[PDB]
Amino acid sequence: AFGVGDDESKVAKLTVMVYNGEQQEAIKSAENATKVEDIKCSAGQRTLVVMANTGAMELVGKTLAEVKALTTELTAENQEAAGLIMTAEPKTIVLKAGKNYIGYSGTGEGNHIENDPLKIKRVHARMAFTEIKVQMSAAYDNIYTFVPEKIYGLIAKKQSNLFGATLVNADANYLTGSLTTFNGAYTPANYANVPWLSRNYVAPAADAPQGFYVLENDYSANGGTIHPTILCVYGKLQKNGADLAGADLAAAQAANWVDAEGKTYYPVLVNFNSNNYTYDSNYTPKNKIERNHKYDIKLTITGPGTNNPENPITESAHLNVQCTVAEWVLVGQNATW
Amino acid sequence: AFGVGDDESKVAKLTVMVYNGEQQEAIKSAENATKVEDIKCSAGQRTLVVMANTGAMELVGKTLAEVKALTTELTAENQEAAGLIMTAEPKTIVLKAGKNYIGYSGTGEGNHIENDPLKIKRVHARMAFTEIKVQMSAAYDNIYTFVPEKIYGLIAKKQSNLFGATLVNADANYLTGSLTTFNGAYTPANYANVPWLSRNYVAPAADAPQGFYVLENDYSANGGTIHPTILCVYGKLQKNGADLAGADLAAAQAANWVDAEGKTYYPVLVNFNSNNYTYDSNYTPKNKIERNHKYDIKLTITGPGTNNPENPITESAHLNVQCTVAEWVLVGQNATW
Amino acid sequence: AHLNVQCTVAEWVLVGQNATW
Amino acid sequence: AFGVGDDESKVAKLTVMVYNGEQQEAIKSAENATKVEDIKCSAGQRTLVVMANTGAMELVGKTLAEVKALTTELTAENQEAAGLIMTAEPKTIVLKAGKNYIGYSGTGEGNHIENDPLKIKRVHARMAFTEIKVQMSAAYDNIYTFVPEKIYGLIAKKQSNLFGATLVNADANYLTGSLTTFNGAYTPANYANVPWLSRNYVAPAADAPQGFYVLENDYSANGGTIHPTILCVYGKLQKNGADLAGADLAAAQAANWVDAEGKTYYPVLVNFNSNNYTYDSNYTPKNKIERNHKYDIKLTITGPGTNNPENPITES
């Protein structure tokens, strides 16, 4: 149940809280709907927060700053598209005496504060493949062939904030569906082999695309190390129809392609702005990942893969040649008999 | 004797007197019965007045002009239903010379003058609690708990008239059984502490209530300032079982909830026509307090109270929120490797 | 001329007030 | 088309490939031109190789250690200037991510690899006659008279390498444009006849020469036995105007001039440093056939010739 569009937008527990300034005054949560009916409170200047799909969390009696600094982390139950926490910003509305309501402009008595319906954005981020097609270059045609096995994502962050402009917090506790043993320049600090982020390869396309849900991350720096949330493919690499064994594992390992079993990796740094990547619809790429974005990618397989998929990517270029023919050398050997 | 049915309607002295125009003619008082025997007087056009349960107060010598402007002030002895001043209206009767009386038509000889027995209102007005049940809301359930100590009422007036159409005059000498230091909007000038209106908390039910006897006051003017008579409950407020201290005691007082010790107020001000109160038997609320009325009130405790009970009250308000979900921001990325 | 007056007493009116906070 | 300068130097196929150590990274070939314009690869440390006129030769997939040991042979196509392999040594360039070009430097954007256009050497060599004028000595004036018939060459080598410095390898499969009947001090063991190294004699001059393309072969040892490359003419030897027969031919066999048919040879050694030869433009001669050289020879007949052209020569 990864991605249908219906389950991506489905509230299950809407919760509205009204404060009078740093103190909990009114709170009443409704379930499996989107209309709230009886939030009784005082009048005057109040602050209005609204959350959805929060699950079983302590929310009674908590103050303003504690609900503004709540943290969630992704579970096993997020990859089946459930428990997607949503959020609007605080907006400090004002209230009249009799009966106030917001949105659905011009229905009954009382008074309307805001005419348009209130918007709530998500907090997750979907990344997925769409196309996986192979096209070997001139230097490997009908020699090396690829078959895919696993599709696991690599450097997914653990936890993030829930309210504000950006969503970052200094808790580097990233999660990984790989061995977490090899270590490139995209350095593993303190990982965890977690059996969620690992799916078997079944039919990637434009309908039901295989992928994962990750939280907000930032790697838009210029110097120092970064931790890009890459997404990779993994599987066996065959040589002219047969499996790689015997007298070619040692030949391949010096070129840094294939692991000791016969497998190889294929990483894609989603939203990274390198020379291998292009973008459609006039999108200048920013070097982070932000909430409410459908990062779907189409890659092309040219040549074999690589070991150590957290190594830095190699950028492409082009060449062209022009040469001249040399001159002869004369001697002129005159002989006599 | 705070009201049994007999200790509050029992005449201790029924003074009755006559007038032939601007000067007295006769007076004779009888005790512990509703009758008088041997008034003697002339015949012709007269004017009859009758007061009851006056007690120690001079009433001889004065004229018709001075008796229509007598003022009484409530004393400390009026809390055991002793000293309830009961009076009537002048009724300009004529008088035949032989023998005539007023009351009990169909008993003796002579001629009756008024057929029904003459009726007498009082001037006081009782206000009392009946049910102080507590039901915390959802936002403070199993967090705050309330226990009452004191019951005192605050802005009762001091003196009034005794005859005429209305009974309220122009005077400001108010009384209060509280700490009376703080100022608010409903705060008149020159009123000080009096230690009569203060009691313990003794199990208030539909039988044997707790309250006071207060006089008349008008606060029906729309603009400007007003001074209504309020009644309050004052008590401790324990946060999660133990005594209130710690980080909350400097946090609750910013919300204007609890005073500088750990105690909370609960005011309710009689006959106001606000959003906060309901009534019954289809009784419209006037904005005053009149004679011969009993005010039994029934509050519930929802949440904490506020300090400074002479502030204007905050009208309640309901709410309805409808929220919609924003859509994805679809980015596209094609990749080469 | 003489006089006898025999008065009665009048009961209150009940005004109930259901309040909330 | 033996020597025009147009057909002698014309790239009928270019082929450019580039490695990253022991594996193939990129490969592309243009045709009938000298420009491959769209090489796509990665960046980093690479090694560049470029070949010309390889023909139908398998170059995809093969590693660097196998490319650096390729061989070739001379063909019948090689004697009319068609199928001349042309290569250069690897030169380990380093690439940049933007755009890199080699040749026509200083004209476009990006950066330059190197300034000059790249040079490609041929692998073959040429040996050819240019002037076969005949002036007999005093002891044969108006007695013997020579006329030529054939032009073939003798001890060309079959195979070689394609990369290195001295691209001669240890093998022995030599070719010959004549008989295997005489066995002098020059004839090697494995030996063969190949009937394309032989034209028929026509009018050599300052232009329109006659000769053969050839590969490279080392015979510079002092002691032991060598195998030098010999070119020759081969023709009748008349006596006093008529054809030679009678009881003089059996008197001519004892001096080993003329064989049983009536003909004689004229062997000449290319680049030999003997007393009988001479040179010009102050050139010391080396005892090997090296790459990309043009050996024009003009000889003067003085006296008759000899049998056994694979015998050692007798200096003056």
From Swiss-Prot, chain C:
Residues 12-21 are annotated as: Important for oligomerization and fimbrium assembly. Disruption phenotype: FimA-deficient cells lack major fimbriae, resulting in strongly decreased adherence to host cells. Double mutants lacking both FimA and Mfa1 lack major and minor fimbriae; they fail to adhere to host cells. Synthesized as palmitoylated precursor. Efficient export to the outer membrane and integration into fimbriae requires lipidation and subsequent proteolytic removal of the lipidated propeptide. It comes from the Bacteria. It is found in: Fimbrium; Cell outer membrane. In some prokaryotes, a valine codon can be used as start of translation. The name (major fimbrium subunit) does not indicate the abundance of the protein, but is derived from the greater length of the major fimbriae. In strain ATCC 33277 and strain ATCC BAA-1703 / FDC 381, major fimbriae are 300 - 1600 nM in length and about 5 nm in diameter. In contrast, minor fimbriae are only about 80 - 120 nm long. This length difference is observed only in a small number of strains, including strain ATCC 33277 and strain ATCC BAA-1703 / FDC 381, and is due to a loss of function mutation in FimB, a protein that restricts fimbrial length in other strains. Fimbriae are composed of a major, structural subunit (FimA) and the minor components FimC, FimD and FimE. Head-to-tail oligomerization of FimA molecules mediates assembly of the fimbrium stalk, while the minor components probably form the fimbrium tip. Linear, head-to-tail oligomerization of FimA is mediated by a conformation change, facilitating the insertion of a C-terminal beta-strand into a groove in the N-terminal domain of the following subunit. The anchoring subunit FimB limits fimbrium length and is important for solid fimbrium attachment to the outer membrane. Belongs to the bacteroidetes fimbrillin superfamily. FimA/Mfa1 family. Structural subunit of the major fimbriae. These long, filamentous pili are attached to the cell surface; they mediate biofilm formation, adhesion onto host cells and onto other bacteria that are part of the oral microbiome. They play an important role in the invasion of periodontal tissues. Fimbriae and their constituents are major virulence factors. FimA proteins from different strains have highly divergent sequences, and this has been used for classification. The sequence-based classification correlates with pathogenicity. This is Major fimbrium subunit FimA type-1. The chain holds residues 363 to 383 of 383 of the full protein.
